[PDB]
Amino acid sequence: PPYTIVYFPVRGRAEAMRMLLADQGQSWKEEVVTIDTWMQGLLKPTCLYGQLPKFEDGDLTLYQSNAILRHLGRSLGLYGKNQREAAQMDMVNDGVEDLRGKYVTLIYTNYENGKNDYVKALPGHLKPFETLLSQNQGGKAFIVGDQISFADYNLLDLLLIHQVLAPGCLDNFPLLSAYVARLSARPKIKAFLSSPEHVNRPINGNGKQ
Amino acid sequence: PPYTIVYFPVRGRAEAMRMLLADQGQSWKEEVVTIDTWMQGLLKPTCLYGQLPKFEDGDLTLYQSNAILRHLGRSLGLYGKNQREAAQMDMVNDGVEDLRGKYVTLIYTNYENGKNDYVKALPGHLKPFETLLSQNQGGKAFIVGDQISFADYNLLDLLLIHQVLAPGCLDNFPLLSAYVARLSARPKIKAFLSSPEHVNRPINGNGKQ
Ligand SMILES: CCCCCCSC[C@H](NC(=O)CC[C@H]([NH3+])C(=O)O)C(=O)NCC(=O)O
Ligand SMILES: CCCCCCSC[C@H](NC(=O)CC[C@H]([NH3+])C(=O)O)C(=O)NCC(=O)O
C-alpha cells in the first residue's frame, strides 16, 4: 500500500477490484483518466500493454485486471486455504474472464445486432457456475471453499452486470441468484453498491449496458 | 501425480504445459481426443466449460489452460520467490494470453486476409516483452526474476509459434531473440522440441500456422 487505481471513468474491469478493496476495509485513490486525455496519446505509451487499468501498490506498479485481482487475493489472504483451492479459484476466474470477454465484445462492437443471440447463449455460459455452486456445500458458501476469495468478487461483478444486460437471466439458476443476493448483502459490499462513487459511475464507456 | 493431459491432436493451448512438464523432468499421460470422438457429444457435456484441455493431477481435475499452468507453477515451484514476483508473472501471462487469443482468432477465422495486418502490428504486441526483459538483469535471465516460471514457458511457446507465422519477427527484438534461443537450448526443452510427439503434432487444427 497505499493503493492507487488509474482507469477511465467507468466500472468495467476495475469495479470488481474496487469492490474487493471496499469489502476488505481498504482505502484507495482514484486517478481518473478521461477519454479525451487518453486520446491525446500521452499516457498510453507509458502503459505496459498500452491499456488501463493500471494499479499501484506501494513501490509496485501493475497492469492486467486479473493480475491485479490475484495480487490482492494473495496479499489479503483471499486465495483459498491450500494449493488445491487456489487452482480451482483460478479455474473459476478464467471462466469469469472468458465470459467477461464476450460481454465486452457485445457491448462495444455488436450490441444492437448481437444482443439477442448473446442472451440466448447466456444460459449455457452460466450453468457451469451454477454447477460449481451445487457441488460446494449445496451452494451455501462461496464459488470455491467456504471463505470469500478474489474469484468471488470478479464472478459477482460479472453476474451483477449481466442482470442489467438481461433481467431475469438468473431466474433459472437459483444457486446463482441466492449467491448474488447473499454476497450483495455483505454490509461493506452493500454500502459500496449504493455509494455515489459507484452509482454515478457507468458500467461501460459507450453508454451501453 | 501422475499427470494426464486430455486435449485435441494439436499443440495449441497444451504445448506450453507439456514443455513445462518436460523441462521439469516430469512424466505424464496423453489422452488424445480425436475430432471424431469429440463429435460423439459424450465428452463435452462432462467438461466444466465444455472445452479442453482437461488436466488430471491425481484426484484433482482442472480445466482452463492458464489455470493448469498456474497450478503446475505453484506445486512445482515455478511462481517466483515472493508475492511481488508472483504478481508480475501474472501480469506477464495475462499479456501472453491476450496475444495468444489474437493469434487464435487470426488462425481460425481470418488467416487469408488478416495475416498482412497481423504481422504489421505484431511488433507492437511483442515490444512489451522486450521491455520487461531489458528491465530484468538486462534480459540475461528470465521474464520475471532469475528463475524459470510458468510465464516463461507460455511466453516461449507463444514466441516460437509466431516465428513460424512470421519468420524473423524477432529480428528487431534482440533480447527476445536471445531469450528464445537461450531457453530452447535448455537440454530438456531442446529434447522436447525435437521429440516425435511434439514434431509430429501440428501447431493448430486447421493446418494453418
Ligand atoms: C467513459 C469512458 C469509458 C472508457 C472505457 C475504456 S475500456 C479501455 C480498455 N481497457 C482494457 O482493455 C482493459 C484490459 C484488461 N486489463 C485485461 O485483462 O486485459 C483500454 O485500455 N483501451 C486502450 C486503448 O484503447 O488505447
Ligand atoms: C485437428 C483438431 C484441432 C482442434 C483444435 C481445438 S481448440 C478447441 C477449443 N479449446 C478451447 O477453447 C480452449 C480455451 C482455453 N482453455 C481458455 O479458455 O483460455 C474447444 O474446447 N472447443 C469446444 C467446442 O467448440 O465445443
The DSSP result for A17-70, as a single string, is HHHHHHHTT--EEEEE--HHHHTTTSSGGGSTTS-S-EEEETTEEEESHHHHHH
Q: What is the whole-number distance in angstroms between the Cα of residue B146 and the centre of ligand 2?
A: 33
All residues at 6 or more sequence positions from A128 whose CB lies less than 8 Å from its CB, including other chains:
A95, B48, B49, B50
All residues at 6 or more sequence positions from B91 whose CB lies less than 8 Å from its CB, including other chains:
A48, A62, A63, A64, A67
For residues A175 and A133, give the distance between their C-alpha atoms in angstroms, rounded to a whole number: 7
For residues B209 and B206, give the distance between their C-alpha atoms in angstroms, rounded to a whole number: 9
Residue found by looking up cell 472445452 in the block: B51
Q: What is the whole-number distance in angstroms between the Cα of residue B13 and the centre of ligand 2?
A: 8
- Cis check for the bond before A202: say yes or no (omega within 30 of 0): no
Contact A74 B86 (CB under 8 A): yes
Other C-beta atoms within 10 Å of A194: how many? 9
**How many Å from the N-terminal Cα to the C-terminal Cα in chain A?**
33
CB A14 within 8 Å of CB A7: yes
Residue A85, SS3 per DSSP? helix
For residues A111 and A107, give the distance between their C-alpha atoms in angstroms, rounded to a whole number: 5
Residue A205, SS3 per DSSP? coil
For residues A92 and A148, give the distance between their C-alpha atoms in angstroms, rounded to a whole number: 13
Distances (CA, A) of A136 to A43, A84, A139, A147, B72: 44, 14, 6, 12, 24
A-proximal residues of B, 147-186, CB under 8 Å: none
Sheet of A28-32, strand order: A28-32, A3-7, A54-57, A60-63
Counted residue by residue, chain B has a size of 209
Residues within 6 Å of ligand 2 by CB: A 94, 98; B 8-10, 12-13, 35, 44, 50-52, 64-65, 205
Here the cell at position B19 is 514443455
Residue found by looking up cell 465486452 in the block: A104
Q: What is the whole-number distance in angstroms between the Cα of residue B78 and the centre of ligand 2?
A: 25
Q: What is the whole-number distance in angstroms between the Cα of residue B199 and the centre of ligand 1?
A: 38
For residues B127 and B104, give the distance between their C-alpha atoms in angstroms, rounded to a whole number: 20
Cα-to-chain-centroid distance, residue A60 = 21
CB A57 within 8 Å of CB A71: yes
Q: Which amino acid is at B120?
A: K
CATH class label, B79-186: mainly alpha
Residue A173, SS3 per DSSP? coil
For residues A103 and A175, give the distance between their C-alpha atoms in angstroms, rounded to a whole number: 22
For residues A110 and A94, give the distance between their C-alpha atoms in angstroms, rounded to a whole number: 23
Q: Say if ligand 1 is within 6 A of residue A88 CB.
A: no
Sheet of B54-57, strand order: B28-32, B3-7, B54-57, B60-63
Distances (CA, A) of B18 to A111, A147, B3, B97, B188: 39, 33, 10, 17, 11
Q: Chain A: give the shortest CA distance to residue B187, in Å.
A: 29
Chain A residues with CB inside 8 Å of B128's CB?
Answer: 48-50
Here the cell at position A101 is 470477454
Contact B91 A60 (CB under 8 A): no
**Domains of chain A, residue spans:** 2-78+187-208, 79-186
Q: Of B164, B140, B143, B163, give the one whose Cα is nearest residue B152.
A: B143
How many beta-carbon pairs under 8 angstroms link A with B?
A: 79
- Among B37, B52, B55, which is best to mutate for testing ligand 2, by the most ligand atoms less than 8 A from CB? B52
Neighbouring C-alpha atoms within 13 Å toward the C-beta of B140: 2
For residues B143 and B147, give the distance between their C-alpha atoms in angstroms, rounded to a whole number: 9
B85 burial level (CB within 10 Å; 0-12, 13-18, 19+): middle
Here the cell at position B15 is 504445448
CB B1 within 8 Å of CB B29: no
Strand partners, B60: B57
Chain A residues with CB inside 8 Å of B74's CB?
Answer: 83, 86-87
Region of residue B147 (phi > 0: left; psi between -120 and 50: alpha; otherwise: beta):
beta
Chain B residues with CB inside 8 Å of A74's CB?
Answer: 83, 86-87
* Residue A53 in contact with partner chain B when CB distance is under 8 A: no
- Cα dihedral angle (A191, A193, A197, A203), rounded to 10 degrees? 170
CB B157 within 8 Å of CB B19: yes
CB A176 within 8 Å of CB A133: yes
CB B101 within 8 Å of CB B108: no
For residues B182 and B159, give the distance between their C-alpha atoms in angstroms, rounded to a whole number: 13
Cα-to-chain-centroid distance, residue A186 = 16
Residue found by looking up cell 511462481 in the block: B79
For residues B143 and B146, give the distance between their C-alpha atoms in angstroms, rounded to a whole number: 8
Nearest to B70 among A60, A90, A132 (CB): A90
Residue found by looking up cell 470477454 in the block: A101
> From the annotation, which residues of A make up the binding site for glutathione?
7, 13, 38, 44, 51-52, 64-65
Q: Strands B3-7, B54-57: parallel, antiparallel or unpaired by DSSP?
A: antiparallel
Strand partners, A5: A30, A55
For residues A105 and B129, give the distance between their C-alpha atoms in angstroms, rounded to a whole number: 26
Number of H helices, E strands in chain A: 9, 4
Residue found by looking up cell 494439436 in the block: B10
For residues B198 and B110, give the distance between their C-alpha atoms in angstroms, rounded to a whole number: 26
Burial B165-199 (b: 16+ CB within 10 A, else e): beeebbeebebbbebbeebeebeebeebbeeeeee
Residue found by looking up cell 462461496 in the block: A142
For residues A55 and A53, give the distance between their C-alpha atoms in angstroms, rounded to a whole number: 6
Angle between helices A83-109 and A65-75 (to 10 degrees): 150
Other C-beta atoms within 10 Å of B53: how many? 20
This entry's atomic model was obtained through X-ray
Architecture, CATH, for domain B2-78+187-208: 3-Layer(aba) Sandwich (3.40)
Which residues of chain A form beta strands (DSSP E)?
3-7, 28-32, 54-57, 60-63
- Cis check for the bond before A2: say yes or no (omega within 30 of 0): yes
Other C-beta atoms within 10 Å of B43: how many? 15
Strand (E) or helix (H) holding B86: helix B83-109
Q: Of B42, B47, B158, give the one whose Cα is nearest residue B93.
A: B158
Q: Which amino acid is at A98?
A: D
